[PDB]
From Swiss-Prot, chains A, B:
Species of the source: Neisseria gonorrhoeae
Family under the similarity heading: Belongs to the MinE family.
Keyword terms: Cell cycle, Cell division
Record-given protein name: Cell division topological specificity factor
GO molecular function: identical protein binding
Gene: minE
Length: 89, 89
């Protein structure tokens, strides 16, 4: 029932990654009704700018994978958050 | 293999919704390494403000459902895009 199971339902992922990751899956569904598309590159843009700012990720670690189909589009975005907190002063 | 199948693998939905919907699933995974959270309410905020602006949705049609678990958090957000393009002039 819980998605957390399907997303990580691949046995035990033991071992410490020592890092952070982000997997944002967008599923936009639009009915024949309505026109003028402009939502896919909209969310991605805000995320690319927000993450680059709010998060410490270089456009070099940004994985993009768009998938369009009829009136259904799905943008798979996976970002790997690096580590560099460094001690205090 | 394709997610589009699992997401809509519920027989044929048929029938025209005459509307648009958005289902953004966020799956943040962080290893014991690192501290000071602040990522879940970060993406949601930018989305709530971006959508309210870039998209025509009232905070009344915003469905929020957070789900935390150990070092894994999943925020399920579903927005229903209304219709009101109206003819031209």
């Amino acid at each position: 029932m819980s998605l957390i199971e399907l997303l990580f339902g691949r046995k035990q992922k033991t071992a410490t990654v020592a890092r952070d990751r982000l997997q944002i899956i967008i599923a936009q569904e639009r009915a024949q009704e309505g026109q003028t598309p402009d939502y896919l590159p909209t969310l991605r843009k805000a995320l690319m700018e927000v993450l680059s700012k709010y998060v410490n990720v270089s456009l070099d670690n940004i994985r993009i994978s768009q998938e369009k189909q009829d009136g259904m589009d799905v943008l798979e975005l996976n970002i790997t958050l690096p580590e560099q907190k460094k001690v205090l002063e």
